[PDB]
Design an enzyme around this catalytic site. Structure first.
Site, PDB file in Angstrom:
ATOM      1  N   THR A  39       0.817  -1.208   0.000  1.00 29.74           N
ATOM      2  CA  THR A  39       0.000   0.000   0.000  1.00 29.74           C
ATOM      3  C   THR A  39       0.855   1.263   0.000  1.00 29.74           C
ATOM      4  O   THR A  39       0.401   2.333  -0.406  1.00 29.74           O
ATOM      5  CB  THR A  39      -0.962   0.016   1.207  1.00 29.74           C
ATOM      6  N   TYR A  96       7.310 -12.900  -7.915  1.00 24.20           N
ATOM      7  CA  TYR A  96       7.897 -13.053  -9.210  1.00 24.20           C
ATOM      8  C   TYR A  96       8.772 -14.259  -9.442  1.00 24.20           C
ATOM      9  O   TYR A  96       8.674 -14.884 -10.455  1.00 24.20           O
ATOM     10  CB  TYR A  96       8.643 -11.819  -9.595  1.00 24.20           C
ATOM     11  N   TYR A 108       3.892 -12.586   5.353  1.00 25.49           N
ATOM     12  CA  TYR A 108       2.912 -11.907   4.518  1.00 25.49           C
ATOM     13  C   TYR A 108       2.614 -12.758   3.289  1.00 25.49           C
ATOM     14  O   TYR A 108       3.463 -12.940   2.417  1.00 25.49           O
ATOM     15  CB  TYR A 108       3.417 -10.512   4.142  1.00 25.49           C
ATOM     16  N   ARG A 116      -0.608 -11.428  -5.778  1.00 27.48           N
ATOM     17  CA  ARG A 116       0.378 -10.429  -6.174  1.00 27.48           C
ATOM     18  C   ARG A 116       1.750 -11.057  -6.391  1.00 27.48           C
ATOM     19  O   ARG A 116       2.503 -10.649  -7.273  1.00 27.48           O
ATOM     20  CB  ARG A 116       0.494  -9.327  -5.114  1.00 27.48           C
TER      21      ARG A 116
END
Ligand SMILES: N[C@@H](CCCC[NH3+])C(=O)O
Ligand SMILES: N[C@@H](CCCC[NH3+])C(=O)O
Ligand SMILES: N[C@@H](CCCC[NH3+])C(=O)O
Ligand SMILES: N[C@@H](CCCC[NH3+])C(=O)O
Lengths: 295, 296, 295, 296
Positions: B46, B109, B135, B140
């Protein structure tokens, strides 16, 4: 527009005692050259671009440019980043240091909108003059460059000439070339090299080619020569190695295979990457025992 | 095991003329502090961690520590990376400069295996002696920290104390706490804060709390005080705003909403992030009208 | 008028091909003996797909008679992917003593949301008993959208809620935040508590075939807002809840019933069949963690 | 193995006044034959198999059989069910009343295991002695016939000769033909007709061919003739119609197009299928008018 097509190799980045092993790297590139490979991609996903420092990344591009200079082989520099200012920085470096073009991965992790993707690539394309190849790998990035965006960018930007597709979606491939026949669709998934090439794709960026540059090079040239009987023949027989090289995340398996073949010294990764589980290790070496590896 | 829980905020990073607006950043943190927020997370997803330099990243942590110093509001610093060496360096700076603990996103990634994930986090956890919150945001990162790996990390590493779960998988949350009730399950998905808290979650790391820190604060503390009817009440009211803040990729809507509320001076992002479509701008603006938004 | 609380998706026991009707009654009696508020004859867990109307309707009757003179209600499986068939099934269940019907979204043919509305509207208008919608997109290939669920609830008096089996707690928040008057029923055993704690009014359970007392206790502890105790049972149950779907429901549950000595033979009707030897061991092993009721 | 390959059409089932329009059905099949189709598939997914009664199902097959008699055109009867006894029942009629073979969809909704799928089809294949084509459409059924399962059935059952693949998975198509080169791979996804054929696919079962049978048959015949350039060209030309024929669930757009073309009398569906949104209605009319449509 100016392009880089044909059989291309996603270079692994070999590691020696933690550091980039500049000898093997420059050496492996020469083994690719002397095996029919049209272009090499330094520091892509397969080259662990994530674990490399900006300096090390810049070094590999430079080495690749310098080992290829004076040959037919081209360098498609991996210049992707999820921050546009870095990607541009990596883009500007490749240009000012003599790469033929760049392969720029879609921003990973931060999940930009299609609008943000457009501006991201526009900024990269309009800061160099060299050919830019888009790279769509939604499984890794968490974002998909839409066909609309891809085509938009191809048309708006003089030096954006195509996309490396690794989304497993052949429907998108038909979609791209049906609405935009002028672009260079590059296979980014080894198992489906043939189907992509048979629908008008103009090259591959292979992981399998690290181990078997001859087989991959021949496949592409057969397909490009529209000798579909032979290209399908090779694609069919390469199916097992192409699949096994993804039983764990690339470039884990390919490095493992490059290790077992004696092509590299150590089976050495930079965390969070590591050597595969013993089961997948057994599965690799077995599949390797079904092919003729050159050195 | 030492922990960091309660109402937490994934701080946005306000830009002015392309650079980090440090005064505004300090001021937003004050606003969070004075509205019942237990801890702040500088530079998370964020906060646009992807597009900050290591130096700006480190400054934001400094500002956060400086602003929360003296309050009992903790600083849970975003320290994740897809490179273990970067993640460790960031974790060490966070320690050395006063952060109470860190938040470490699963490597994005490069899709490490579960084995690689374990070693990635173990390396981090061994690098500093402050709480480490895992996390998990597979949408994502492209990878999922399995429940088994999470529990192994928690049990093997003294300072790994829990996970921020952002996967929209309530089964996993049930799985996590049914096997390891001692860990701190933190909601990282605002829309379902209550279901996670009510199943034993001990806090949230919220995007919404940038705009409505009071509401999220009250929600968490009602739940933590086992007043589920009031926590659910608030969660139901917040559902509209909770969904609209993801009409495009976080933090695009939240930053737009902050700008519309006059809480930040300009609507500026670093590419590849940008302003939302004119439509979503109108939709966000419309949804905001239904809420009392505390000023400074 | 509604049907809520601890409900069981009854298994359909086979002996030599035909429905063991005495075993059916014994199992239903067993459910009633353990505090179950409603039974669902011929759900998905009852292998509705492989049953004949001669049996589909035998089962419903047995359910009605066995429950006749108790507080336990009968929510008959009455769904189909063909509206005229689902209407017939709805009318049958009614004309044969059912207290309500469970109607799955049309599988396979993937109707639009408009079609889903016209489907359920035609069902609700055909009978005067309550209608519980059933959303299980992993099975049907379509999802009843939240807007469609709410419209149906508001437009038709006897549509009173939805069995949710999508494992999407966000949708459960969405439904009960916008339409807090509807009866959200849990259709996924592992997450019974989180659904109940958000305002769910019941579960339609697979696990309650095996452990009816615990599921009944969970559901009633949550209805009394003793969330602490409801959560304890839900956590104790997670392992059996997950292993009961290690293969497709109702393969593991029938295997469990068999292992618990509650049905005569492990007999499915194709395309369903016996679980692998591995999962048989898993199921048997997991079961040991639990005290299981006899008749 | 006895096979059924080539250009095939998943026949629409036109309704007039709630009943199957038997005469229009034969008229449509005749049109298919005249424009060069190799086989027709009565009462598949496009045929609204779900909403037809057993009487109508059998009726449609017989019309297909009797219309194709005295021609080279084969009848691949839809005869799937998610109950094996019903699927064998369907199979037994189709065999006894003229059909050259059967298309049998993977059991939908009940998700049988791979072992179950094997025994399902083995029970089918060994109960009738006509060719059986497997139908893998996981988006509709919720289950997937694995490559290994398909090859086992092919090898252990004499009359199972291939699979209609509608999973949009070209990797799977490679896996199949690379391990079992005798497999008759049939495209069940119009948009990817060419890529499937170019990899050794031997036919298509098309939704688009209802409207444009000449183009689909031309495509397939070109591909079988190794004329990939012309086959791809047509596939590229058909892409838009192949895609908008799925803006809503098949067979909703196709039946709409046939009605707007004047090929059928009325646009009637049996619920839960229904007329498309008025905007999607205009969308279908728009796209179809960009193609040359054959009358009777
Ligand atoms: N590990 C970071 C930085 C990479 C820097 C260039 N090799 C990333 O993957 O984005
Ligand atoms: N852009 C890189 C480096 C960020 C450095 C500051 N957090 C990444 O997303 O990991
Ligand atoms: N197997 C068929 C028939 C079921 C008969 C009982 N409702 C179907 O599920 O549609
Ligand atoms: N709805 C049922 C009806 C089948 C009747 C024969 N076509 C099914 O699709 O299986």
């Amino acid at each position: 527009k100016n392009i880089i097509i044909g059989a291309m190799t996603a270079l692994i980045t070999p590691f020696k005692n933690g550091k980039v092993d500049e000898q093997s790297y420059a050496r492996l590139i020469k083994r690719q050259i002397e095996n029919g490979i049209d272009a090499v991609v330094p520091v892509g996903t397969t080259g662990e671009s994530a674990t490399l420092t900006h300096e090390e990344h810049r070094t590999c591009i430079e080495i690749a440019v310098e080992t290829c200079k004076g040959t037919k082989v081209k360098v498609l520099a991996g210049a992707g980043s999820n921050a546009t200012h870095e990607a541009v920085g990596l883009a500007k470096f490749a240009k000012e240091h003599g790469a033929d073009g760049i392969l720029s991965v879609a921003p990973f992790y931060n999940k930009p909108t299609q609008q943000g993707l457009y501006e991201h690539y526009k900024a990269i394309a309009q800061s160099v003059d060299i050919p830019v190849l888009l790279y769509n790998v939604p499984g890794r990035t968490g974002c998909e460059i839409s066909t609309d965006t891809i085509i938009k960018l191809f048309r708006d930007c003089e030096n954006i000439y195509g996309v490396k597709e690794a989304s497993g979606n052949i429907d998108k491939c038909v979609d791209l070339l049906a609405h935009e026949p002028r672009m260079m669709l590059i296979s980014g998934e080894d198992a489906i090299n043939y189907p992509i090439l048979s629908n008008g794709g103009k090259g591959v960026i292979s992981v399998t080619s690290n181990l078997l540059p001859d087989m991959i090079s021949a496949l592409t040239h057969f397909a490009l020569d529209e000798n579909y009987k032979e290209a399908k023949k090779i694609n069919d027989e390469l199916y097992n190695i192409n699949k096994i090289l993804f039983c764990e995340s690339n470039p884990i398996p390919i490095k493992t295979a490059m290790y077992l073949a004696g092509l590299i010294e150590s089976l050495e990764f930079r965390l969070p990457l590591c050597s595969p589980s013993k089961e997948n290790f057994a599965k690799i070496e077995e599949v390797m025992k079904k092919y003729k590896i050159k050195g």
